[PDB]
Each structure stands twice: as structure tokens, then as C-alpha cells.
Amino acid sequence: AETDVLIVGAGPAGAMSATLLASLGIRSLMINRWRSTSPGPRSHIINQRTMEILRDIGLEESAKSLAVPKEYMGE
Amino acid sequence: AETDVLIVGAGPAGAMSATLLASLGIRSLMINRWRSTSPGPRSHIINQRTMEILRDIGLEESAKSLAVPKEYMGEHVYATSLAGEEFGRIPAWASHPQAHAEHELASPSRYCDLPQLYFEPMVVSEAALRGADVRFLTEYLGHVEDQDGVTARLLDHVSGAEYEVRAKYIIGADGAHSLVAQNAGLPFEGQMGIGDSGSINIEFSADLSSLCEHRKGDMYWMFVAALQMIRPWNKWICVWGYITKEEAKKIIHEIIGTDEIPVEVGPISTWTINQQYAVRNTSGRVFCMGDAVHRHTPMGGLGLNTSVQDAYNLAWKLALVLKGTAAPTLLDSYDAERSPVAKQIVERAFKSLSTFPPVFEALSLPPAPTESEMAEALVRLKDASEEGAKRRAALRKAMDATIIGLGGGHGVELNQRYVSRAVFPDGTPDPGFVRDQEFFYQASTRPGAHLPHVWLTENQRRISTLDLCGKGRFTLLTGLSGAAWKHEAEQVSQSLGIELKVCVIGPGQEFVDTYGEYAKISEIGESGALLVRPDMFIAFRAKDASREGLEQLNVAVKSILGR
Amino acid sequence: AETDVLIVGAGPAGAMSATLLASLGIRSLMINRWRSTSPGPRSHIINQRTMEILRDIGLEESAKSLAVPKEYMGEHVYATSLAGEEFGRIPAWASHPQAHAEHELASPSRYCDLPQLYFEPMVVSEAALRGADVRFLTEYLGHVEDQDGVTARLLDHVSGAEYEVRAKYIIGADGAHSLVAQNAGLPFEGQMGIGDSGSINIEFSADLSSLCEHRKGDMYWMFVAALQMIRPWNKWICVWGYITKEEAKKIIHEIIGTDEIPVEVGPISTWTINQQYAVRNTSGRVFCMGDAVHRHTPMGGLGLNTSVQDAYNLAWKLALVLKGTAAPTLLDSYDAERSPVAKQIVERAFKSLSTFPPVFEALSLPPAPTESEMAEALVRLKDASEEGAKRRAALRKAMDATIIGLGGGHGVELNQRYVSRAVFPDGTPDPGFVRDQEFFYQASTRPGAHLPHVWLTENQRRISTLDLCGKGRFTLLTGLSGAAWKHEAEQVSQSLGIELKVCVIGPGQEFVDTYGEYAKISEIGESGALLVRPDMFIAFRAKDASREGLEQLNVAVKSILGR
Amino acid sequence: HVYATSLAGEEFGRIPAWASHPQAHAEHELASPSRYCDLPQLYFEPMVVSEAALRGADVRFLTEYLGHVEDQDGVTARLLDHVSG
């Protein structure tokens, strides 16, 4: 097996790297020890830097559709 | 590599099977030749059967969040170009208020638009999280059955390795050129579908809100090319019957009928189908489903939906046999119940094509007009003569008849009628359909029919009869005077080691017949009982709670399970 | 003081009358005995005919802003108390999906809930701005007709002065004890409606959204007291059949079934009603409308809606005669067309009352049950026996039958059928009704029927056939092959001095038969014509554009105008 | 708030009117439970006049004040009634 970039892990950091790299034409292979994406919710707060990245790569609208908006989070 | 069920293919039928199986505790391994879920949207119409399945396995809300709702789908426009003049419209996807009432009455769920592009990763994701092993870049090469299982082989497109994966059953979910169906030796029929011409599909991005927002429609047809919404109203796809350069940008610009709004051409695809259906879908330990056994035209959006329902018929059955709760003969009902649906949709999807020629004939246009020939057609259409009046009426009659493949086929969608060893007949004759069975759904609680939807209440909140059932288990529905069913069901349940959940609907119970709609729909007295399979179909119906009525419960379950 | 029309009364019929007349250029003076528009909510159900009228005169969007929409009115709950246990619900105000379609198909408008408390000042204010003189604290004492007009005596409750007014016509919109109907000598029939019966109303404030938000309804009936939403869900009012001090707060608490949500007792009123109808509504120069000619129960909410429609029938007619465009015989059609509606609704509102007793008979209660008797009837209702099953079904049958006064009377609301000199017969016989004419609307384009609603498009935007008409003028509707109507209408208009707009609906026109629903609904060929009165009733129908067809328009309009 | 040549012409620029800038919006939201809205007098007027009448005020249009004369205990005004003359 050959590739330009081997990405070990498929959580947020690995998945994001893979998406960006593949968007740039770079061959990559992303691997994960387990069966699935993480079963637990684990981490829920999405700050503006991350939403900006999603916006740039075109996943913001889809992110917003699954996400509980800001006005539900205040109290 | 070992597993109970090897699932070849990870589109709607495979992904759905994996999710259902993993939900039932069954070890499975799902494979896919390619890198990803399908790149194209391909198939967008989600009928009520599919939404009900998503509802049962808990993905409906998430399905609804990504999906364009029903009220955006109604305006089907026939015109010259998007910014040109309309010939007229038909109310598509049951947007006519009467169609809409029939629609809402039939299910707790609704038409939506969700391209395959989003549906697949959604379901493949859940499959993997519920327990299914999922492995892409891996190709089924062949298999060998023997008395205890199968031992197919795989080509691993990442490591280059090739290995074997023993399994108790194989599901062939591998599409329009299913190698699993060939190997299993399934007979096909009805190849005659008119020359098997492909279509061409051009993706593109452009903001067409100003031409669309006021007549919200799922698709705009031009006289024939279909301009189809992917996202309202900026992502699109241009489609028509059948190489092309980035010249396709010109084609689009005339289909839009105005080269003013910026267009950004995406990928270009070709689809060429061969219309056929499998006469049988089962052979030994091999079970096929989806495009693998029913391949047809897009008219009606029956493919993805029937595919997913194939998977819903089969999973709970595999699970019972694998658990030993059911004899392996329960699996014979898969072919008996799903194969008639397979021929029904190929034939139906084909029959709809013939509703378009008449549109041209009304226009007095040859199977293929010229520019000047079309232009004259529109002039003749505004003719203030008695003959021009006859022509406008002829055009309207022809347009109206295209509804059958654009939302009008409700009966086709929902009127499943199962006859098999997994439906215990109640002795009544088939009541048939009072109205056209293609156009109109007729609810029935006779064994073999899907359970009818009605609203009950739980905590003064509306809940569907459907939401009482499913969950991969047999549910028995009765009323206060059918109190005895609770006990019979328990006895039956211990004997057979099979879970059946009983709901006594009535005043002061968990579930209340608050509108009386259940008493109205059930077709039997209050103390009657309906037995509902994991896939929502009724398999047994008792007309009361008398001795003989109750005694028959055990007999029925014992007959459904093959024991 | 001098005016063209004196309008005694400023509730719905009087106010609507003043608004329409001012919109038509007619000087009128509207008076009211009291200080301000009706203090109480006093009736809340707005039907579609009324919304159509508000649409025509441009107050619909405004009415919809203050009103509670249809989706909030459907859950009609029968229970012990709000916080107690439901007996069941029925789908009120056409909330069942089949009832909802039938509703949506009949009109561009919808049921809403708008208390008279708000409706009144909205219309009175528009009367004043459009040109009507409005004078409250002013009481009509009597009048004396002569050959040229009438001279009424008024008592000014601000200045104590008493003065006269000279007018050409009087409208008696002065309510259930109309002194204008007395002096005009109008005969009344049907006094027989039980012993005279009155109800009591207790306004109160309280946040009951926790018992109401999950089951949104216009009413909650407790077994009989009605709990009625004024504003969702904090302004309310108890109603029930018939002095009371702040003990009214114990009643309320008992109706709510809990004393845990803070309450605030407002005004306490009674209402009497002596059910009768006027057999004739016209005497010389005096015209009565509203409660003044039809007095009845609130079942069905036909009162305010019929009253407003009384005024819509009359206004354009007074205007045409006052302008000399029409002979005074045109006013004869007011009684011919509206008096049958008057008897119809008194009898209907009364007949609905007899749908309630059977609810109690099903519970095997008596006309009036004790607290023990009521708690025994609930126990019997939860009985797990065949005898109990029969009782639950008997209750459901009885409850369902009460729907006729709670949104089921679509036919009553819409099936007006006028026969008079202001409707020119077309030679066709009365086709009657295929289904029950009380429960179901049947659209018709035969002269004497309201113009049917369908959707055309203007600029690719939906517009109702109704929105092409009205505006206080005659409108003639035809299609492309009926182009000749344009000229024939011009000649009639010039000779008779009457405005009649022609609309040629069809491809390329200002109004397009986009869905073909006009061709479907018109009942005649494309070149046929429909003539629509200012009040939306069809007064003339030609089946084509032939010579004899065309020549008849003049005769028709002449005949309608009394000329 | 748009400054332009014509509605369908070309903007010179815009400014954030009626506290629409986010900082202006916060300052606004912090000062009161209420907000700016646009409601023409054409509608505001009949809404309040009608509430005056229902709450207890006597309301008399077509009636003109001509003058008055104050004394120690009250005032006596002369009105001209434009309906009755």
C-alpha cells in the first residue's frame, strides 16, 4: 500500500485533515482502530473557528441543520 | 474472517440491512467496492414506507433535518425553459389538497426530498455504530456454498490482499449488475423495456431562487430535459434521455433559458439501465435485494424505497433463524413476499414512460421537434379558435396523466399484499380495492396488509399505531375487552422463547383511542387482536377474545416461525 | 342632519354595511347606542365567506394578524375537567385531513378564531376612514317613512339633545331586539325553540398553556360547561346553559379541575336569545340584517358570519340604486336571497342542540348527573367487558354526531342558492347535491351560486378566481375562444352606465389557467362566460360565444338592474 | 437604510439604521424589555382610540372645540357638532 499521507485516527483532527487534503488533490489514507465513529457524544461545543472551517469547505449549512442553535444554549 | 451475514454492497439496501441486523444483535460484515458512499445524488424521492422505517429505527428526525420537505415539492412545471413561458403545471408529490389528505391519512410520515448523496452516509454511519462491521475498498469476487454456510472471497483494494470470509448467509445488495445474483443463478424476466437507452446527468451550481421561489417545485421539465433541484435553490442537476465537454454549460444556459445567472458546472454522469426483475430472489443461503433483483426506470422514485423495504422484510427473519427462535423455512417468505413487489415496480416504472408521448401529440409535435416546430406549437396553443380550445384541453388531459409517475401512484407505494408462510390467514376472503389500486391506498387489517396508521394518544400526546409496534419484535394490539390476550401472549411467549409485546388500547391505558379512529380502522370488535410483525405487516387477526379465538394465537406464531 | 343611508347599529352587520357603502361612494351615517364596540368576545368563529369578504375589501391580512389560525382550533376535548381525564376528542373546525382538504378546496380563505371584541373596532375604524360617518352614544328612537325618504329621531347621549336625520334608506342592524324591525312591522316565525334559554359567561385570566399547548383546541367541554380560549392560552371564558359573585372563582377552579394555577376573574355576563327569524327583512325603505332578522343559538357560529354576509348582499345594491344605475326593484332581491338564509340558520343552530343529550344517554347518565353519578359513569366506561365495549362505542357515536355544530356544517356555511330577480336563470335545471348539503360544500357555476374558488396564476403567482372579481363591480370571466365577450361587455357597459370588467383567462393572458382547474370547474366550454355580481354570486352563465349567447348579456344585465 | 440613485439603480452605501449594528442592538436590548418596530399612525390610532372607548372614555368624533372660559371650579367649553350642526 502506497500513499502521500498516512493519517492515523479518524476523529475530528484526522477526519478534518483527510477532508482538507483530499480537497487539495492530495492522496491520503485515513485509518481507525475501531468499528465506528465515536459512540458517545463526548464534546458538544462548536466555536466560531470550527464553523468558519466548515463554512470554507462547505459543511456549515449541514452542520447547522444537525446542531442545536446558540439561542438554546444560554441558560 | 468470520461472520453470520455477509452483505455485499453498501447502498440503501445493504446499509439498511446492516443497520437492522446490527440492531437485532446479529454479527454482519458489509462491504463496498468503492471509496465512498455514492458521489451523485441519484435518487431523491423518499416515500412514506421508507420514512416509517427510519422512524422505527430512530433516524426519521435526522432524515427530516437534511430533507427538503413536501411543501417544496409540489409545483411540477412544464415549460420551454426556466425563464421562458409555462405550458402548465401538475400537482406533483401529492400537493393537491385531496391527494394531500389521502397522503396524510395513510401514514404518520411524509414525502420528502433527500438525495442518495446524503441518505447513504447517514445509514452507513448508523449501521457501523449499531454493531455492523463496515469495510469499503473491498470487492466480492465469488463464493462457494456448502451445507453449513458460505465461503466467499474478497479483493482488498487498499492492501492488494485477497482473503476469505466465511458466513452463515450472504445478502446480495450489489446493484444493477449483481455478481451475487449471477452466481446464485437467479432467473430474470421482462428484459423487453424498449431499447435500453441511458440518460445523461449534468451537475451545476447556480442561484435560481428568483425563478423558483414563487413556484416551489421538485423538478421543472422542458420540452425533454428535467431541471431538478438538489438544494433550494442553488444546487442542481440537468437530466435527459439517451461524451460532452464543458460545452454542457451551453446546454444548461438554454435549459435555464437565460445565460445571465452565473453557472458553475459540476460532474457529468451517464446512467444506462437494463429493465428486468428477478423471478426469484433467493437461492440456498444467498438473498438478493435492491437493484440486484429489480432494475427499472426512475419514473415514480420506486427504486431506493423498494430497495430499503426489501431489507426491512428480511432482517428480522434472518435474526430469528440465526437465534434459533425460527426454523430456516421462515426465510422462504422473503421471495414469496418481495418478488411480486419486484416485478410490480419494474413493470409500473416502465408503463409510466408511455404517458409522455401524448404530451407531444397534443402539441401536434413529432417524437422530436425542431426549434421552429416547437415555436409554432406555442403559437397554436394561444389560438383563439374553437380548435385551439380543443388543443389546450388535449394538452391538459395529457399533462394530467403524467401524475402517475410523479406522485399519483400512492396505491403502488403502499398497497403491499403478502401471501406466504409468514402470514397466517384469518379465513376471510380478499376484500379487494374499491378504488384504483395503483392511484389509491386502501388500508386493511387483514393478515398480509401493512398495519394501518391512526392517531392514538399516550400522555394526551398524539402517537401512531405504528409507534406501538416494530422495534424488531412482534406486537399484539387489542382493547379493554380483549384483556385476556395479555395472558395468552405471555404463555405463547415463554413456550416459544419469542418476545411479543401486548398493547391494550383504551380509556385509562398507556395508549388511548382518543379519537376513536382505532375502533373505526381495525375492522374487528374491541376484543379482537392484531398481530404485527417486526416489519409492520399484520400476520394474524382474531375477531374476538373467545376461547377458540385465543387458542389460535399459539398455532399462528408456531406457523409463522416454521415450528 | 342629512344622509343617504342611516345605519342603526354598529356591530358586525352595521359596521360591514358602512365600510362597503363608503367604499362604493355612498354617504352613510352609522350610529350606536353605546360608548364603544362590544366589550365581550361574543362569538369567535370566522368562516370562509366572511374571510372572503375581508379579502375583497383588503382586511384579511389584518384579520389574520389578530386571529388565532386554524391549526389551533382542532382539538375539541370532552372531559371531566381540564386537568382531569378526557372522555374523548372530535376533530373540530375541519381539522380532520379529509375535512381539511374539502375546506381548502372550497375557498382561498380559512377558518380562524377572532373574538368580536377585536373584529368590531377593526371594521368600524375602516368604515370611518373609507368615508362613513360614525356616531356612537347616539340612539335611534323611531322614524316615519314617506315617499321620498325617511326621517329618524335620535337621542344624543352626550349632549342630551334629540335631533332628526333625513335619509333615503334605513338599515336596521340594531340586533336581537331590533326596534327598527318592530316599527317596520316585520313578521317573525319559529318562536318555538325550547323554553327561552340563556347562558352565563365568566371571563378570567390564567396560564393554562401546560394543559392546552399539547392538545391545541378552540374549546374544552366539561361534562355542561364550555372552557373557551380567548387568547392562547391565558385569556379565557367559562360558558354554560342557563347573580354570581366572586364564587365564580370556585366554579372556574372546578372546571379547570385544579386550584393550583393563579386565576383572575373578569366580567360576568348573561345572554338570553329568543330563537326566531324574520319571514321578510324589508319594508318600504327599511332593510334589516343581522341578529335583527335571525336570532339563534351559537351552535356552529353562524351568527356573525351570516350577519356580515347580509350586509355584503345589500351594499352594492343600495349603491347602484342610489346612483340611478339600477331601478329600486333591485332591492327586492335582498329579501328574496337573504330571508331563506335567515330561517335556515335559526333552524340549524337549534337542531344542533339535540346532538348533546345522546352523549349523556350513552354514559347512561340522566339530563343532570351528580358527582357520584359522574364518577360511576367514568368507571363503567373503563369496563373490560363486551357490555363496556358497547358503551365506549355508543359514547363515540354520540360524540361524533356533535361535530355538525363544531365545524362539520361546511355545506350550511357555503351552499347558498339564490333565486330572485337579481339572478338571471340559464335554463339548466337545479342539479342538486350529490352529498348531504349540510355537511358538504358543493361548488356550482349555475346562476345563483357563489363563484367557485380555483387557483389561476397572474405573474406565475397563485391568485384565486375570487380575486379577479368583487371590488364592488360586475366581472365577466371567459377564455381565449371567448374573446368576443370583451366587446359585448363594452357595449353593455356603455349603454347601461355600468362597470363590468372582463377577464379572458388563458395562456399568455393576464390570468393563466395554470393548473387547468378553471376548465375543470367552470362547467362550460372555453368560450362560455360567467358573470359575477359584486357579492361573488354568479348572476348569468353562457355556454359559448355564439350570437344568441352574446346577445343575451344585454338582456341579462338589463334584467338584473330592473331596467 | 440604503442611499442610492434609484431603488433599482446603484447604492452609494448603507448605514445600520434603527440600532441594527450589533453593538447598537445590544445597547438597545439592554435598555428595555421592548424594541423598535414600525407601525404607521394609520393603525396605531384606531387601536388606542378603540381601547379608550372600551376602558371607559367617551369618544365623540365630528365634534369641534370652538373655545372655552375657565373659572375657579372648572372650565366650560363650547363645541360645534358637525353631524347635527
Ligand SMILES: Cc1cc2nc3c(=O)[nH]c(=O)nc-3n(C[C@H](O)[C@@H](O)[C@H](O)COP(=O)(O)OP(=O)(O)OC[C@H]3O[C@@H](n4cnc5c(N)ncnc54)[C@H](O)[C@@H]3O)c2cc1C
Ligand atoms: C447514476 C445513477 C443515477 C440514478 N438516478 C436515479 C433517479 O434519478 N431516480 C431514481 O428513482 N433512481 C435512480 N437511480 C437508481 C438508484 O440509485 C436505486 O435504485 C438504489 O440506489 C439501488 O439500491 P441498491 O442499494 O439496491 O443499489 P446500489 O445503490 O447500486 O448499491 C450497490 C452496492 O454494491 C456495491 N457493489 C457492487 N458490486 C460489488 C462487488 N462485486 N463487491 C463489493 N461491492 C459491490 C456498489 O458499490 C454499491 O455499494 C440511479 C442510479 C445511478 C447509478
Ligand SMILES: Cc1cc2nc3c(=O)[nH]c(=O)nc-3n(C[C@H](O)[C@@H](O)[C@H](O)COP(=O)(O)OP(=O)(O)OC[C@H]3O[C@@H](n4cnc5c(N)ncnc54)[C@H](O)[C@@H]3O)c2cc1C
Ligand atoms: C352577550 C352575547 C354573547 C354572545 N356569544 C356568542 C357566541 O358565543 N357565539 C356566537 O356564534 N354568537 C354569539 N353572540 C351573538 C353575536 O355577537 C352576533 O350574532 C352578532 O353580534 C349580531 O350582529 P348584529 O351586527 O347583527 O348584532 P349586534 O352585534 O348586537 O349589533 C347591534 C348594534 O346596534 C346597537 N343598537 C341597538 N339598538 C339601538 C338603538 N335603538 N339605537 C342605536 N343603536 C342601537 C347595538 O349597540 C349594537 O351596536 C353573542 C351575543 C351576545 C349579546
